Design a binder for this molecule. Sequence first.
Ligand SMILES: CC(=O)C1=CN([C@@H]2O[C@H](COP(=O)(O)OP(=O)(O)OC[C@H]3O[C@@H](n4cnc5c(N)ncnc54)[C@H](O)[C@@H]3O)[C@@H](O)[C@H]2O)C=CC1
Ligand SMILES: CC(=O)C1=CN([C@@H]2O[C@H](COP(=O)(O)OP(=O)(O)OC[C@H]3O[C@@H](n4cnc5c(N)ncnc54)[C@H](O)[C@@H]3O)[C@@H](O)[C@H]2O)C=CC1
Ligand SMILES: Cc1cc2c(cc1C)N(C[C@H](O)[C@H](O)[C@H](O)COP(=O)(O)O)c1[nH]c(=O)[nH]c(=O)c1N2
Ligand SMILES: Cc1cc2c(cc1C)N(C[C@H](O)[C@H](O)[C@H](O)COP(=O)(O)O)c1[nH]c(=O)[nH]c(=O)c1N2
Ligand code: SF4
Ligand code: SF4
Ligand code: FES
Ligand code: FES
Ligand code: NA
Ligand code: NA
Lengths: 156, 155, 418, 418
Amino acid sequence: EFEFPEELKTKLQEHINYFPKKRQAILLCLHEIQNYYGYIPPESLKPLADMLELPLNHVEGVVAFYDMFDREDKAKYRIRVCVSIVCHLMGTNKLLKALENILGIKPGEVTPDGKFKIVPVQCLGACSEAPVFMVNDDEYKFESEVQLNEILSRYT
Amino acid sequence: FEFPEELKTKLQEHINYFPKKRQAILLCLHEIQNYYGYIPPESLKPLADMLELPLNHVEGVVAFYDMFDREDKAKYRIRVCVSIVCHLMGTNKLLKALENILGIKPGEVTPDGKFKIVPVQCLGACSEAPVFMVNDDEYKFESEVQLNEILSRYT
Amino acid sequence: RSYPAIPRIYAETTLNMLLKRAKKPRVHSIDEYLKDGGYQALEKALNMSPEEIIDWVDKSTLRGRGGAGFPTGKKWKFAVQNPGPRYFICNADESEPGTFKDRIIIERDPHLLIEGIIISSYAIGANEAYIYIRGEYPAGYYILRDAIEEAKKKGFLGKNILGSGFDLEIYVARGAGAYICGEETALIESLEGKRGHPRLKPPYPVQKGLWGKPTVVNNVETIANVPFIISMGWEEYRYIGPSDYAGPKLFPVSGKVKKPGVYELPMNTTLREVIFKYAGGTLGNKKVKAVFSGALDCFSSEELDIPMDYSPLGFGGTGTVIVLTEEDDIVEAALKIAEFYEHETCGQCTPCRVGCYEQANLLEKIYKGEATEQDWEGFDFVNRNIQPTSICGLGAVAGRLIRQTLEKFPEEWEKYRK
Amino acid sequence: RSYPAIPRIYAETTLNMLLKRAKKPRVHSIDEYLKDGGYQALEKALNMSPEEIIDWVDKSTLRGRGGAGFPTGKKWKFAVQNPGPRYFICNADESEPGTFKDRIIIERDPHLLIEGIIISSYAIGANEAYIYIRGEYPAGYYILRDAIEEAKKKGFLGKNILGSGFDLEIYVARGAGAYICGEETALIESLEGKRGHPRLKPPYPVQKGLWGKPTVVNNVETIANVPFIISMGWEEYRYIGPSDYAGPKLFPVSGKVKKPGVYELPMNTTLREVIFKYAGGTLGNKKVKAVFSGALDCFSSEELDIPMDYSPLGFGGTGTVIVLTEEDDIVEAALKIAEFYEHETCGQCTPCRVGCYEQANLLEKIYKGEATEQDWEGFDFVNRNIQPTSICGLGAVAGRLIRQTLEKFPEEWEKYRK
Ligand SMILES: CC(=O)C1=CN([C@@H]2O[C@H](COP(=O)(O)OP(=O)(O)OC[C@H]3O[C@@H](n4cnc5c(N)ncnc54)[C@H](O)[C@@H]3O)[C@@H](O)[C@H]2O)C=CC1
Ligand SMILES: CC(=O)C1=CN([C@@H]2O[C@H](COP(=O)(O)OP(=O)(O)OC[C@H]3O[C@@H](n4cnc5c(N)ncnc54)[C@H](O)[C@@H]3O)[C@@H](O)[C@H]2O)C=CC1
Ligand SMILES: Cc1cc2c(cc1C)N(C[C@H](O)[C@H](O)[C@H](O)COP(=O)(O)O)c1[nH]c(=O)[nH]c(=O)c1N2
Ligand SMILES: Cc1cc2c(cc1C)N(C[C@H](O)[C@H](O)[C@H](O)COP(=O)(O)O)c1[nH]c(=O)[nH]c(=O)c1N2
Ligand code: SF4
Ligand code: SF4
Ligand code: FES
Ligand code: FES
Ligand code: NA
Ligand code: NA
């Protein structure tokens, strides 16, 4: 059977102990799992369900519902590119083009080394700084291709 | 001079508390000071009688212990720590803020008899320097705005 | 110590209240907050009865800053007429297009929000409070957790806060990508560890919420007003702005303005003033074509002299001002709004489920000039028929802004039909 | 119900013993103390002989936490070799600069102290115990009075405690502004209703103390260890920290650190670790210049690698850690130490009376740049001659820290001599 490495299991248990009820920790746990693995491994869900004392189908449904979670593609760094109205107006397409020039990938794709995945997302609430992208937890205004290139060089 | 009933009773409680009456002397003087806003020189003779001590024993004790004040009546004593940690962390800022708000410096009483600033040695709250007390309440000084709001609680 | 990178959103205030510290783009920790007199309102509040606090918030005229403008004191009163235990929820899911007012409070002055939460929880007798922060605000999450520990250190949280006998813990939950989890009942479902499916209302949360118990949900900005109301008193607070819609309000301005960012202004400010007096006018000094109030409304250049208040003729909503100028294609803009709703319908209700999808599907065809005659008449019909049977505000409004563009910019739409 | 305001001192523990409850800045009442297994050490103690309890405390290696580090068990043994009646005194006068470790036990976990007093009193055959708490801890006084009543009501004090036949009353006395009343013999004089004048030692209080009777005086922190020693047994207690200097220790850290407060750590911790690993390093990441061990010792930045134990090369004292950084004027700091001793000499001994006065008066002239050459030589001479004929530790050490600053920071002093 699949088992969580102890360093991850410890963190999962912290989340589970944090709220008054175990099941409230489900999203924090799933975030933590995706942080660890670069995606949600299908196999991870059964042990998580046990820890949450939830049925597996409940956990599966939750993973399916929430768009931040990814069961398909392993990626070290997720480049979330906002495709909503303000970033669109102010130059989402220039950001995507710059990203294709540097990395050779389009939205939904992963680089051959498994390092970068471009993820199109709705409004990230930084619209004054459009066009906006995140790299994992870090968030930035796109200025130009040379600028983007320098930022991405910081992720190794 | 004679103590009011409510205070006499309170003094008698202290005197009855310890095995021997004379052990209650400091609790009694704190009570007197709390009541009057200072130690009335006239209060000491009746206290001595109650403690079954000579008058000058009592006088010697009042003189010895720095918390007791026979000179100045004040409703609120602002005890400001002037020892090493509070000094390092900004006693002088607190004192200036106090002068800005109240118009007095250490050792002085406001004209209305409401506040007296008393410089004291380490108050045992050095992690929260600079420290002050207002009567029995104790606080960290953050700023003049903050201090002003605290003092406004004392009417 | 170290938080994820956050863009430095410009912030400006004429009132120096909610943005007194948050006008500076950095985390203000508890010592800086305390130096500005922070948590003194909490101390004052704890020496009042909960009922007086509710009374003050009521008389302040404070209304929900999350977008609907429900009177806050009145919401509290509804909660407290029901038996406890009760819960307090801070809604930090802020995911409306153009909307970034709440994150600058969270990320720069977290103690302002926390103080507000403690006071509000005390007012309604809640001993357990939650912040639900959207998953795409990771920095906000870490900043709040750290701030909450600071508040614990200093005795503003925990049992018997400042000898009052009032107990409170604040739990920080994270979203995971669903706009709909900002809808107060879907938010509660998510807090309960489930999918974010809105519940039929009534009941409202104040009658039946988290674990079926009386629950107040309030927006970040709403809660951040509460320390001021207590500190100044309700009367002084009511001096700020118009006496019927009083208090500071945050306006997130984006798109084709010279100075995009968050403006703290009174609600008698006009939309024209927001754009031209505060936000520096338009990029290239082009003419304003339209303003999108998030994804909710579309105002034309003929509608700029309206007040930024919660009145029938006012701007209303979140205060979100997305400026489009004369060269911005309105149909292209409409498509993006359709794409937004397509992506966020939870799909419980059939007209919402299929309507949000078809509106986006068909508008894409129109935009690309691949639409048939039926696709056109179909788009019109679907747009008018998303709302039926809907149990939440998303289905109620998914067609609203787009309909307003059809009515206010017929000439541009016609270019796409002919 | 209500107590005077107390600032919320930060507290952190790696051992979860003395600070298991007191890490939280609030009063823990008897029910919460009982829920954590409190008073079961007392029950266990009362099923033991006094002699066995003394033996365990002895074998624990517990040493006096009031600063001298005298072996506690040995002290108790000395007392019980003398005929009764005997008295037990808890020293809560804590007035050393930088020192605030005892008050967080008193104010947050009073039952830990009370339980320790009852066990210690039983061990030495005392039916009458005292807490002497400085007058500037008014909240601590009320908290202890209330806790004592709680313990009476649950039958832990009074006659025939839990059927043992052991009688105990704990009386709480207040100081009134005199640092010297923490010296054990001056404390006793004050308890006897007199001025706080130290007595010639020997005799030690264990031979002749309160009313001339065998009397044990122990520090608050010392006594707070006693429940643990009974609860876990002495073997298990000795397995905390190094085998020779065992058990938890409280370290009150103040001055130029990021996280000032009280730390519960084992005594193998180094001074460097206290400052950098636990207290978060220095304000502004400035270089450490000196640590003042209260008003007793001054350590330089070259002595940071020493253990916080009672060994000859160790930190010793109360564990008080006052951090000065590179900008801090050492002469200005020495003046504050001189002013402290000037203010607290009781005046019985001539070199102490005149020495503490002249040290401060002359050092102030040096500081203000108004000192003559004779003031300089006079200052030096007086610093070296406070101690002769002194009958207590104040006269013995009133020049000690200042002398250490003269030796360790010659450059800074010479700058003042011009
Ligand atoms: C900030 C942000 O990202 C977003 C904000 N919104 C805003 O959400 C608003 C719609 O919210 P909702 O559907 O909650 O509105 P409502 O009018 O039904 O209720 C407003 C508040 O008042 C309470 N309330 C309303 N009627 C009540 C009643 N009869 N009794 C008790 N409480 C009542 C209700 O529980 C909610 O807290 C729109 O105006 C948008 O501006 C929408 C999406 C994202
Ligand atoms: C916590 C606080 O506010 C302060 C603490 N101190 C500390 O007080 C210490 C000096 O205290 P003292 O003069 O009492 O020390 P000591 O070494 O003479 O005696 C310590 C204890 O051991 C007993 N003791 C020592 N030798 C003994 C003997 N032969 N027989 C019996 N008891 C003995 C003695 O009676 C006292 O309780 C210094 O190290 C300071 O750190 C000083 C000022 C304020
Ligand atoms: C689809 C959808 C999404 C959201 C909302 C509504 C709907 C229909 N609401 C409004 C929310 O339901 C509720 O009215 C407020 O949180 C109540 O707080 P105030 O009364 O505004 O303080 C909402 N509110 C908020 O504070 N943050 C958010 O992110 C959202 N998101
Ligand atoms: C001037 C001065 C002042 C104090 C002390 C000494 C001197 C010289 N001592 C130490 C005290 O005399 C005695 O050694 C201890 O109280 C004994 O208890 P322990 O053996 O440390 O538990 C002391 N001890 C303490 O517990 N609290 C205090 O406030 C003081 N103050
Ligand atoms: S109206 Fe739409 S978003 Fe709201 S509950 Fe129904 S399907 Fe879900
Ligand atoms: S050494 Fe100083 S403080 Fe101690 S008894 Fe003598 S005069 Fe008093
Ligand atoms: S539209 Fe991209 S961050 Fe808002
Ligand atoms: S030096 Fe001021 S409280 Fe200690
Ligand atoms: Na002074
Ligand atoms: Na921000």
